[PDB]
Amino acid sequence: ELRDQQEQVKEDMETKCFICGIGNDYFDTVPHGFETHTLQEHNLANYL
Amino acid sequence: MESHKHYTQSETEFLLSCAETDENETLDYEEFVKRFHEPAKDIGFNVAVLLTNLSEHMPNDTRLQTFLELAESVLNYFQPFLGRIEIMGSAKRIERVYFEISESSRTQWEKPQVKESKRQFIFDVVNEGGEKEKMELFVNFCEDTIFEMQLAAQIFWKKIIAYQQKLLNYFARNFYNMRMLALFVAFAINFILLFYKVSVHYVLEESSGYMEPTLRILAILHTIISFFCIIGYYCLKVPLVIFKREKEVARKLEFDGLYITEQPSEDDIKGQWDRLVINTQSFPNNYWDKFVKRKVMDKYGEFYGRDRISELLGMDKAALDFSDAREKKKPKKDSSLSAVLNSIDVKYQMWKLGVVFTDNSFLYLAWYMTMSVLGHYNNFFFAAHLLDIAMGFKTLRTILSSVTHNGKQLVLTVGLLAVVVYLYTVVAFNFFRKFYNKSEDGDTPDMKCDDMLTCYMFHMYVGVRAGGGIGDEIEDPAGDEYEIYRIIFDITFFFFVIVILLAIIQGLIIDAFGELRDQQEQVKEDMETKCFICGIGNDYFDTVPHGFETHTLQEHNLANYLFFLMYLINKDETEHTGQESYVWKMYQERCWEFFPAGDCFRKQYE
Amino acid sequence: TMSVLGHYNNFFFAAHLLDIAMGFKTLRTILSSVTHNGKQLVLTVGLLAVVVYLYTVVAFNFFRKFYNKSEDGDTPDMKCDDMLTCYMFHMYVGVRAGGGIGDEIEDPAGDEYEIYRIIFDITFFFFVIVILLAIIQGLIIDAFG
Ligand SMILES: [Ca+2]
Ligand SMILES: [Zn+2]
Ligand SMILES: [Zn+2]
């Protein structure tokens, strides 16, 4: 259970936005869409 | 022709009107079909794709219905010859393009090695690849597979070369049966080695003749079969991997500028080994693309120095060779008269060697060869050849991949086991050192605890495998001086070391095995109940009978897409249609938006 | 035919007790489970046999003086002076011993081969006992589930 919680946290950080949490498939339309959305638009470092 | 029930009398007499009557009442039908069938076939294919387009666009018209019954009467011949693709581009709508598929292409697709390449691509693109680079990997697979098909179709100086080439071709064609024959001979040799005995003096005693010399015969035969397997592999599968690497490095040079502006890192040995021959003479030897050098020169010459680019990319002092070949080029040139050998480039040969010696399969074959050679010295080394079934079968490969899967976790849990065993060893060496007397009569006590290294070895060797802790094998306390502490020591040992850490390791291997099996069956289920190209799903097509099967075998066939790419490559451009030229431009600019992402013809129209 | 053969030897009527296995539902489930993962079970048993044969060959080559299954003798009952005998002894004792193979043959207690013998037994108790038997057990239990 501890291992599964760790990997689930990792999967949620990889395939879901932290701030809005709209999902991944919505941004999986243009190339590199979700990655650019998480690195430019909704960056936690940017919010800080 | 009139009794075969495929011709009426009018057709029979019309075809007899085409006779030759070579003054002896005789025609040679070879000549007949050699002259009267090919253009008929071509124009029939053209009108067939026309009628197919008209049908599959405009349905349900009685006039078009009789035209369509005639169409299908023609199409019963052109069914395995026309392929259809669903492009999405240039109109924001799904377009069904039609093209021709060659019989040679169909045969090369039926060939075995392309089938194994296809199944491997499917597996490693459904397991590792997602959807961002799925079309990238699919186009790369199509290119590698058309190169595979070209190679398979390809499969004093005019007396030895023409024969040794045929020998290499036979080896490459007979590589797999050579592997099965090798496994047979290894099984036979290991059965003979099983029928064995000992006198210090090795002897095959359990037999009465007819078995001693056959061991040596089967040994030398196994060795020659290993050599033939390796030699056939080097000419069957090494071209493919070297072409893949050449394509990768050439596209990295052209697009990204890996050795022009984006010099690779220190640990990527692949980057250094490719930099080794980014400047060789025959760099794109198998990528069939012999102008990547000039392309990258024209791309990065006006910014980083044309002289420096021509120096670091090979072909030095030849910046005007293009103009020299365009204006009054040389017609041809004889090979040589004094230089019969050493014409090949030693740098490119060394690069090919360094790339094949890291293939992870040529290495396995070389291990097989050296194990056979060592078995020639000591016949018992032929037992290592029994592990060939572990790589030949699927579930045994799964077990091996499972024992390798959770590598870091397995190493770390074994380390924690060692550390806790060392803790128990130290506490037993300090306090409970008088109980480790592994003797029954002696009278010399065999104290296994009068030494730290000996006690730790004894612990990690006996207490972990005893299945019941460590105190079921060393003497019981039976004395109220340390009994409670000794009892706690053993229950703690039998807990942490036996029923916890070993259990965790066992679970690690079994869960890795189960995860690998589940990934395999999930790949199978996704290939069975989901489309590869569009991936709309199954239930959408589960409306008409055989709907999804016909959709996957006719509309969105991966073989059809590959044949369409091959047709575009061998289409002799300036003759492309609108859709064909559009798809070719997209493929040249490396965009791949012409694949139907989340739509199809049925979802677009009625 | 089992009834007819029981007419000859009355103890053949014991095969008729397996009728409950077909009459009940969960016993039919257990039988269908032992038959379900057929190919996987055969292949994992084969891998077990091959790794046991590997251990048999290495023990026959190097550690052949430890397989003395006698207490007084004085005739040594060497179970390793023969490949077929050693392989049979291995696949019969080391797989069912529940603790590897060295809990039933003599301990090294000598700095001539002790470390290699120790590695041999931990590797055996790993791959043969707590891995392959466990994989087979899991195969049947997961088929049943
Ligand atoms: Ca044109
Ligand atoms: Zn967001
Ligand atoms: Zn589809």
Side-chain angles (χ1 to χ4, degrees), chain A, chain B residues 1-319 325 331 337-606, chain C:
Chain A
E1 283 176 3
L2 264 48
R3 220 172 55 205
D4 289 323
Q5 285 176 8
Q6 292 176 2
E7 61 83 12
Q8 174 185 340
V9 166
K10 187 186 309 301
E11 182 264 352
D12 278 332
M13 282 300 105
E14 267 182 330
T15 82
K16 187 185 176 184
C17 186
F18 189 88
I19 300 293
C20 64
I22 297 307
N24 193 27
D25 57 354
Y26 190 90
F27 306 96
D28 295 294
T29 61
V30 302
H32 302 141
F34 188 80
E35 183 272 353
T36 58
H37 164 82
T38 31
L39 210 62
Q40 310 288 342
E41 308 183 17
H42 280 182
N43 203 334
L44 312 184
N46 278 7
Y47 274 70
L48 189 137
Chain B
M1 73 180 23
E2 79 186 359
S3 61
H4 279 44
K5 225 155 240 189
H6 289 171
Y7 276 140
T8 196
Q9 199 47 40
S10 315
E11 287 180 3
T12 57
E13 60 89 15
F14 179 81
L15 265 176
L16 288 180
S17 196
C18 298
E20 277 71 23
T21 78
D22 224 274
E23 285 91 304
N24 52 1
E25 196 61 38
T26 359
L27 65 97
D28 359 11
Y29 58 90
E30 288 96 76
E31 123 39 5
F32 203 89
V33 291
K34 218 266 324 155
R35 177 167 50 181
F36 285 88
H37 174 60
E38 287 78 2
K41 180 174 61 179
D42 309 340
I43 287 89
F45 167 77
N46 281 275
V47 68
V49 307
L50 171 61
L51 291 160
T52 306
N53 197 322
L54 279 160
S55 170
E56 280 150 73
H57 269 248
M58 293 200 52
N60 313 304
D61 296 315
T62 297
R63 43 185 193 271
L64 195 47
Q65 275 301 324
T66 183
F67 279 146
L68 256 185
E69 169 293 25
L70 303 175
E72 61 82 25
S73 139
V74 189
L75 305 187
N76 282 99
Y77 180 81
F78 288 112
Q79 271 302 326
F81 279 99
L82 62 89
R84 56 200 78 179
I85 309 299
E86 293 204 10
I87 305 294
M88 187 276 287
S90 135
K92 289 300 179 60
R93 285 175 287 100
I94 296 290
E95 319 186 82
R96 301 174 69 97
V97 303
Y98 299 80
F99 68 100
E100 182 189 3
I101 298 174
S102 315
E103 322 88 347
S104 311
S105 177
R106 278 287 178 84
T107 317
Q108 304 321 118
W109 182 255
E110 190 270 357
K111 280 305 191 63
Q113 47 268 15
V114 310
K115 304 165 66 62
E116 283 98 14
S117 196
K118 167 185 61 182
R119 69 184 58 176
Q120 221 28 34
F121 154 73
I122 289 179
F123 293 159
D124 84 298
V125 74
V126 182
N127 274 321
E128 294 185 84
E131 293 253 326
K132 290 286 177 65
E133 304 180 8
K134 179 163 59 65
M135 293 313 175
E136 174 61 29
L137 296 182
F138 176 57
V139 173
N140 288 15
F141 158 74
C142 296
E143 298 170 4
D144 309 329
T145 315
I146 63 185
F147 179 79
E148 208 148 358
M149 289 163 56
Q150 292 182 355
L151 171 61
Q154 182 280 357
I155 291 178
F156 174 77
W157 209 253
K158 192 33 193 192
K159 301 187 303 182
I160 175 63
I161 305 313
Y163 180 77
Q164 145 106 5
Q165 255 340 333
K166 289 184 58 183
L167 212 95
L168 266 299
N169 285 334
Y170 170 75
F171 284 159
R173 189 171 61 258
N174 214 322
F175 169 67
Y176 289 143
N177 247 348
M178 277 297 182
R179 291 289 294 169
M180 180 68 102
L181 179 48
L183 176 61
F184 207 49
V185 173
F187 189 18
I189 303 174
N190 274 274
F191 179 74
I192 297 296
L193 264 327
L194 173 51
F195 283 168
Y196 178 78
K197 214 173 190 302
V198 61
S199 313
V200 68
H201 190 65
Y202 293 162
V203 296
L204 193 140
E205 191 172 351
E206 310 172 336
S207 84
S208 99
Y210 205 65
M211 311 229 167
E212 191 275 330
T214 44
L215 190 149
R216 313 171 297 106
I217 310 163
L218 289 187
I220 52 176
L221 197 103
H222 183 290
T223 313
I224 69 169
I225 289 173
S226 295
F227 188 64
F228 286 169
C229 276
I230 255 183
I231 279 283
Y233 179 88
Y234 185 79
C235 65
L236 175 65
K237 305 292 297 179
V238 172
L240 183 52
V241 56
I242 70 180
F243 151 78
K244 291 181 185 182
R245 203 198 186 97
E246 279 185 352
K247 166 172 67 63
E248 189 65 272
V249 59
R251 284 172 178 172
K252 282 189 171 184
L253 267 52
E254 168 185 348
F255 292 86
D256 309 353
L258 181 62
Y259 307 101
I260 303 334
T261 68
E262 197 261 283
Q263 273 280 338
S265 134
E266 108 145 308
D267 47 305
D268 315 62
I269 188 66
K270 306 254 213 180
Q272 277 73 238
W273 203 246
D274 294 356
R275 178 194 304 164
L276 178 57
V277 296
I278 50 181
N279 63 87
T280 180
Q281 173 62 220
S282 86
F283 159 68
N285 184 69
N286 287 118
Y287 189 37
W288 62 75
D289 222 318
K290 275 80 180 179
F291 315 96
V292 54
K293 285 176 172 294
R294 291 300 303 177
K295 198 174 305 177
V296 66
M297 280 178 184
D298 304 0
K299 188 169 179 58
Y300 296 100
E302 281 87 312
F303 207 98
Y304 295 87
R306 184 183 180 185
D307 213 338
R308 188 190 74 97
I309 290 303
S310 45
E311 190 214 60
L312 177 143
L313 272 295
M315 235 11 284
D316 309 319
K317 192 201 194 327
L337 200 46
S338 176
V340 183
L341 292 169
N342 311 351
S343 313
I344 323 164
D345 44 355
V346 99
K347 274 200 99 94
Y348 182 77
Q349 289 310 116
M350 210 56 217
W351 176 77
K352 188 173 183 176
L353 213 54
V355 162
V356 63
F357 269 99
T358 70
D359 199 17
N360 207 17
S361 161
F362 184 85
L363 171 147
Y364 174 79
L365 269 194
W367 164 88
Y368 214 88
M369 188 64 199
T370 180
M371 278 303 176
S372 187
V373 168
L374 193 43
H376 262 303
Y377 298 155
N378 185 18
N379 59 18
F380 274 139
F381 276 98
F382 280 96
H385 298 324
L386 285 155
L387 296 177
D388 196 16
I389 62 176
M391 295 294 184
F393 283 94
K394 211 180 159 173
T395 185
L396 312 180
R397 278 206 308 260
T398 300
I399 295 184
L400 295 214
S401 312
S402 73
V403 77
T404 44
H405 196 251
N406 287 323
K408 182 178 182 179
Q409 218 170 345
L410 184 62
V411 166
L412 268 294
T413 180
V414 167
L416 183 60
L417 180 70
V419 176
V420 61
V421 163
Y422 173 77
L423 224 20
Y424 284 112
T425 284
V426 173
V427 60
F429 176 88
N430 185 280
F431 298 88
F432 301 155
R433 91 164 53 83
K434 73 188 190 67
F435 296 106
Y436 290 108
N437 183 24
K438 274 310 288 161
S439 70
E440 271 184 40
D441 42 78
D443 204 43
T444 44
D446 212 33
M447 288 295 183
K448 291 294 178 58
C449 190
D450 288 359
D451 187 6
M452 205 143 317
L453 185 56
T454 303
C455 201
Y456 177 73
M457 210 61 60
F458 169 76
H459 268 238
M460 82 117 179
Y461 168 62
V462 178
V464 301
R465 319 175 311 109
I470 207 178
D472 152 311
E473 60 81 20
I474 57 170
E475 64 177 13
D476 44 354
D480 206 17
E481 70 285 326
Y482 273 145
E483 79 219 359
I484 46 185
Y485 307 103
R486 192 272 196 280
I487 289 204
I488 298 175
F489 171 89
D490 292 26
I491 336 183
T492 49
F493 195 100
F494 170 71
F495 217 32
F496 298 156
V497 183
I498 294 298
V499 307
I500 289 176
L501 278 176
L502 256 123
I504 288 169
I505 300 177
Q506 188 184 62
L508 281 173
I509 254 158
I510 298 177
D511 292 318
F513 181 61
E515 283 176 3
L516 264 48
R517 220 172 55 205
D518 289 323
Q519 285 176 7
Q520 292 176 2
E521 62 83 12
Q522 174 185 340
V523 166
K524 187 186 309 301
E525 182 264 352
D526 278 332
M527 282 300 105
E528 267 182 330
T529 82
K530 187 185 176 184
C531 186
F532 189 88
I533 300 293
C534 64
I536 297 307
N538 193 27
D539 57 354
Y540 190 90
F541 306 96
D542 295 294
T543 61
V544 302
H546 302 140
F548 188 80
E549 183 272 352
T550 58
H551 164 82
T552 31
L553 210 62
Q554 310 288 342
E555 308 183 18
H556 280 182
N557 203 334
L558 312 184
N560 278 7
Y561 274 70
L562 189 137
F563 297 152
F564 176 67
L565 285 188
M566 193 175 185
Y567 183 64
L568 284 191
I569 291 188
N570 300 15
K571 193 41 193 176
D572 200 336
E573 67 168 343
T574 64
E575 296 179 352
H576 294 189
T577 68
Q579 306 153 328
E580 292 190 17
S581 165
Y582 172 77
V583 173
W584 177 258
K585 184 182 62 179
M586 299 210 92
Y587 162 77
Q588 287 275 40
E589 265 86 89
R590 313 286 295 183
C591 171
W592 314 290
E593 287 215 51
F594 62 95
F595 289 102
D599 215 40
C600 57
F601 198 75
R602 298 181 53 175
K603 291 185 60 60
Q604 188 70 220
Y605 299 139
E606 304 93 20
Chain C
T1 180
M2 278 303 176
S3 187
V4 168
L5 193 43
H7 262 303
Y8 298 155
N9 185 17
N10 59 17
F11 274 139
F12 276 98
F13 280 96
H16 298 324
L17 285 155
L18 296 177
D19 196 15
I20 62 176
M22 295 294 184
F24 283 94
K25 211 180 159 173
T26 185
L27 312 180
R28 278 206 308 260
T29 300
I30 295 184
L31 295 214
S32 313
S33 73
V34 77
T35 44
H36 196 251
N37 287 323
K39 182 178 182 179
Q40 218 170 345
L41 184 62
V42 166
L43 268 295
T44 180
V45 167
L47 183 60
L48 180 70
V50 176
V51 61
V52 163
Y53 173 77
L54 224 20
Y55 284 112
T56 284
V57 173
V58 60
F60 176 88
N61 185 280
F62 298 88
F63 301 155
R64 91 164 53 83
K65 73 188 190 67
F66 296 106
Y67 290 108
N68 183 24
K69 274 310 288 161
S70 70
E71 271 184 40
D72 42 78
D74 204 43
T75 44
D77 212 33
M78 288 295 183
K79 291 294 178 59
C80 190
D81 288 359
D82 187 7
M83 205 143 317
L84 185 57
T85 303
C86 201
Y87 177 73
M88 210 61 60
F89 169 76
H90 267 238
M91 82 117 179
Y92 168 62
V93 178
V95 301
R96 319 175 311 109
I101 207 178
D103 152 312
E104 60 81 20
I105 57 170
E106 64 177 13
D107 44 354
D111 206 17
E112 70 285 326
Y113 272 145
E114 80 219 359
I115 46 185
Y116 307 103
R117 192 272 196 280
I118 289 204
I119 298 175
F120 171 89
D121 292 26
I122 336 183
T123 49
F124 195 100
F125 170 71
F126 217 32
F127 298 156
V128 183
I129 293 298
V130 307
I131 289 176
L132 278 176
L133 256 123
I135 288 169
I136 300 177
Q137 188 184 62
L139 281 173
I140 254 158
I141 298 177
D142 292 318
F144 181 61

